[PDB]
Homo-oligomer: A and B are copies of this chain.
Amino acid sequence: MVLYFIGLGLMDERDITVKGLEIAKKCDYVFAEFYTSLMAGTTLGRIQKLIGKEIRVLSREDVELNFENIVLPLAKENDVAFLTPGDPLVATTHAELRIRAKRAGVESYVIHAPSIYSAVGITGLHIYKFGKSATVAYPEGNWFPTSYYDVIKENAERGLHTLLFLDIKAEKRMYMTANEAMELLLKVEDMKKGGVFTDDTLVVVLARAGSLNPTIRAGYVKDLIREDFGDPPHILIVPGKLHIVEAEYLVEIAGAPREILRVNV
């Protein structure tokens, strides 16, 4: 009868909400995609075991090109669920699928889950101080994306923090590390030379948020750029002007150099 978009959360199958779990358990058919983000390798088997249903995993093409041919037809006479990493509508184009559902006469409901977008709170940076967000995309052949560099500049000018989602090419098992993101940014700085991202820029890295032991590190690019932050997924953040307590947390919790405790108001 209906279609449920259910988020699985940040890191593993236990990041699903009780609400999402109880609803998924009652669905006739269950689909999912694992290309918009990276979760624990054992999330599928465990979530299948958790909801007690066989789950059909869909590729980006299956969804973007054939969602209304593979999933919607079933949601016409059965309760169907579509599982996704984190929150289904954050930094994805899945919201458009609700429009496809409506046009096919299918009612849809959304069950949220922990998202990397709000998990940034664990970095100690005030979430209301984040400005426009951006994605550091892998260059492709002669194509070298750079717009994310301009986002940092725009936010920095306003004293706002910049959240940088990192690229992912699931079919190729490619998950961009904060290290790779920093290298690309230094390359763009070389071209544009705007003094936006350099070896002296303070950055914050959050790896495997949602796990009980995520890696939270803050420091200068020259120091962080070759540091091991553990397995992906990773996000990179370029803070703007820091409040005293933000710097204090970065130093006490994220191991930032005590030098940042001193803020130039």
Contacts and interface: CB of A to CB of B under 8 A. Distances in A.
B17 A16 contact: yes
Interface size grouping (class) on chain A? 35 or more
A258 interface: no
A22 interface: yes
A135 interface: yes
Interface stretch (A58-66, A69-77, A111-119, A228-236): A111-119
A70 B135 CA distance: 42
Contacts of A212: 109, 111
Contact of A118 (B118, B128, B134): B118
A191 to B, nearest CB: 23
A171 interface: no
Contact of A248 (B10, B99, B132): B99
B112 A9 contact: yes
Given A118-B117, A127-B90, A135-B128, A14 B10 contact: no
A244 B119 CA distance: 29
A241 interface: no
A163 to B, nearest CB: 8
B18 A95 contact: no
A249 B18 contact: no
A245 to B, nearest CB: 5
Contacts of A105: none
Interface string A55-97: 0000000000000000000000000000000111111111110
Nearest to A5: B122
Contacts of A127: 89-92, 117, 133
A112 B96 CA distance: 26
A219 interface: no
B90 A121 contact: yes
A131 interface: yes
Interface string A134-174: 11000000000000000000100010100001000000000
Contact of A18 (B14, B89, B98, B134): B14
B114 A87 contact: yes
11 contacts: A9-B17, A12-B19, A18-B21, A18-B50, A89-B121, A90-B118, A92-B126, A98-B253, A112-B114, A115-B115, A127-B133
Q: Rank and list the top 5 A-B pairs by shortest CB-CB distance, nearest first.
A: A89-B121, A115-B118, A112-B114, A14-B19, A128-B133
Given A15-B17, A131-B160, 5 more contacts: A18-B21, A92-B128, A98-B253, A109-B212, A111-B212
